[PDB]
Amino acid sequence: SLADAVTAWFPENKQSQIWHAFEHEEHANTFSAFLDRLSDTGFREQVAAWLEKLSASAELRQQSFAVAADATESCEDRVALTWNNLRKTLLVHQASEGLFDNDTGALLSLGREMFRLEILEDIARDKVRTLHFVDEIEVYLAFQTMLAEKLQLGVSGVTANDLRTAEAMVRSREENEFTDWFSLWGPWHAVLKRTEADRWAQAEEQKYEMLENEYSQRVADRLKASGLSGDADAEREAGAQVMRETEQQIYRQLTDEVLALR
């Protein structure tokens, strides 16, 4: 009952024997459902191209199946989140092959796109909390379609002001937060491990050294800030924020530099 949904994306022409082949791999239960759901809302052929590399690489299949299953299966299923994570995955495996090595410009756009899609998902998750009988996939697509043109990529309750509002908040967050985010992005990271092996280790080292000189002190510069010294967990959390802020500054530096090359 997956070989069904997988193949319904191929044409009347190439329509399953390749996919009955996988019907017992861990998470086909969930992956099938996800597809069903995706069609049930050009594109068809590209989704098929995607499914091709998933036949061509086993490792990628397990990863994509895994991603489909790992969702926080709370509410709204996070169809949009899953879709976006499945691309992040393919980007990672694609970069891992070496498809962006001599084309880090292409990666820069895709990242931009992806960033914008990530944000549109948050906006949509939010909007759907005040709407009855409208699943978040619907609102996401409304945004994605209507701002497809305006952001270089019909649902009742989503209005002209919402679109104009969402477009603004993206454009704001893109200018102020993009480079910082690309710096941290799994696909960029594969590429750095790939092409710029050496500058990478130097960044690794660069962060150990920053931790050494500044973790403890930066950690105290928060328990004096939040006024929560003593509390065991409030220290826990402030430790972790310090980790992420040193990793952020390292890899930005690294991105800045490795892009200056191109």
Q: Which of 98, 144, 96 is nearest to 118 (CA)?
A: 144
Respond yes or no: is residue 75 known to be catalytic.
Answer: yes
> How many angstroms separate the CA atoms of 68 and 82, rounded?
6
Q: What angle do CA 21, 24, 26 make, to 5 degrees?
A: 125
Which amino acid, 205? E
Q: Is the CB of residue 3 less than 8 Å from the CB of residue 20?
A: yes
Q: Name, in order, each residue with C-beta under 8 angstroms of 13's C-beta and a sequence gap of 6 or more.
A: none
Hunting for tokens 């996939």 — which residue is that?
Answer: 137
Q: Which of 192, 173, 172, 174 is nearest to 184 (CA)?
A: 192
3-state secondary structure the chain: CHHHHHHCCCCCCCCCCCCHHHCCCCCHHHHHHHHHHHHCCCHHHHHHHHHHHHHHCHHHHHHHHHHHHHCCCCCCCCHHHHHHHHHHHHHHHHHHHCCCCCCHHHHHHHHHHHHHHHHHHHHHHHHHCCCCCCCHHHHHHHHHHHCCCCCCCCCCCCCHHHHHHHHHHHHHHHHHHHHHHHCCCHHHHHHHHHCCHHHHHHHHHHHHHHHHHHHHHHHHHHHCCCCCCCCHHHHHHHHHHHHHHHHHHHHHHHHHHHHHHC
Question: In the structure encoding, which two tokens stand for residue 230, read together?
Answer: 């003593």
Domains of the chain with CATH codes: 1-71 (1.20.1270.130), 72-195 (1.20.58.360), 196-262 (1.20.58.90)
Question: In the structure encoding, which two tokens stand for residue 100, read together?
Answer: 């962006």
> How many angstroms separate the CA atoms of 7 and 51, rounded?
9
Question: In the structure encoding, which two tokens stand for residue 1, read together?
Answer: 């009952």
> How many angstroms separate the CA atoms of 120 and 148, rounded?
11
The size of the chain, in residues, is: 262
For residue 55, the tally of other CB atoms under 10 A from its CB is 14
> How many angstroms separate the CA atoms of 141 and 147, rounded?
10
Q: What angle do CA 168, 117, 181 make, to 5 degrees?
A: 85
> How many angstroms separate the CA atoms of 88 and 185, rounded?
9
- Residue 244, burial from CB neighbour count under 10 angstroms (0-12, 13-18, 19+): exposed
Q: Is the CB of residue 151 less than 8 Å from the CB of residue 109?
A: no
Q: What angle do CA 59, 64, 67 make, to 5 degrees?
A: 130
Question: In the structure encoding, which two tokens stand for residue 102, read together?
Answer: 């001599």
Question: In the structure encoding, which two tokens stand for residue 80, read together?
Answer: 């949009």
The residue annotated as part of the active site, out of 75, 148, 168, 169, is 75
For residue 5, the tally of other CB atoms under 10 A from its CB is 20
> How many angstroms separate the CA atoms of 44 and 176, rounded?
35
> How many angstroms separate the CA atoms of 132 and 107, rounded?
38
Query: What Rg value do the Cα atoms of the chain yield, rounded?
Result: 21
